[PDB]
């Protein structure tokens with residue numbers, strides 16, 4: 133037995149998953165198949181040092197660390213665009229006060245970036261350039277200060293987050309829950325946001341119970357990961373303050389600039 137209330141939650145889950153696939157070109161399922169070797173055709177070129185970097189750099193001038201960081205900032209900008217497209221599909225989102233929509237995106241995009249970045253990670257590195265490349269965790273750690281530390285907390289989070297074994301259908305709802313957070317600073321009308329999140333939370337809970345019936349309290353464990361994300365973002369923003377002051381010759385994309393502007 134499942135009922136009409138639960139039926140509407142399944143319809144919501146379906147809609148979100150559909151929109152997620154439409155918005156995010158490289159899904160977790162694709163990322164895993166690339167990372168696991170379901171493959172003679174999907175094998176990534178692996179960047180693990182300077183030469184391999186130079187070699188890989190014909191499928192994608194200045195210092196290596198800056199090239200990587202700026203490559204990372206550019207992909208973040210693209211992720212922001214994809215996440216914004218996805219957000220508009222969340223029912224109710226575009227009906228919210230325009231200021232609140234902006235606020236939700238402002239505080240939500242980075243937490244989603246790191247959630248979804250985990251899909252592209254294992255303990256040994258991260259998929260890059262639409263999955264055509266793989267950059268090792270050790271290579272990123274070897275970068276001159278203050279870059280050698282920029283990806284470490286993301287990997288640390290990914291390894292733990294990935295142990296939840298969520299699939300894209302789960303993630304579609306979870307990232308919707310993240311965006312529709314009524315606790316964001318400066319929100320004008322919290323109640324309409326809370327009402328949407330409540331329904332998302334309901335959809336998320338049913339989704340995890342059906343998809344992961346033997347994974348006890350998965351719902352609670354997932355919600356607790358919010359803390360980790362919030363912390364990654366805080367550290368990232370701090371590191372960015374360091375970069376701005378040490379690398380005055382390194383331009384930061386304005387979209388990212390505005391998101392970081394007076395954040396937490």
Ligand SMILES: CCCCCc1cc(OC)c(CC=C(C)C)c(O)c1C(=O)O
Nearest residue numbers: 199200203204207208249259260261262
């Ligand atoms: C000389 C550029 C090397 C790749 C830069 C890069 C770096 C990078 O950080 C290691 C990432 C993933 C990171 C985020 C989405 C934050 C990337 O997706 C990419 C990319 O797609 O090009």
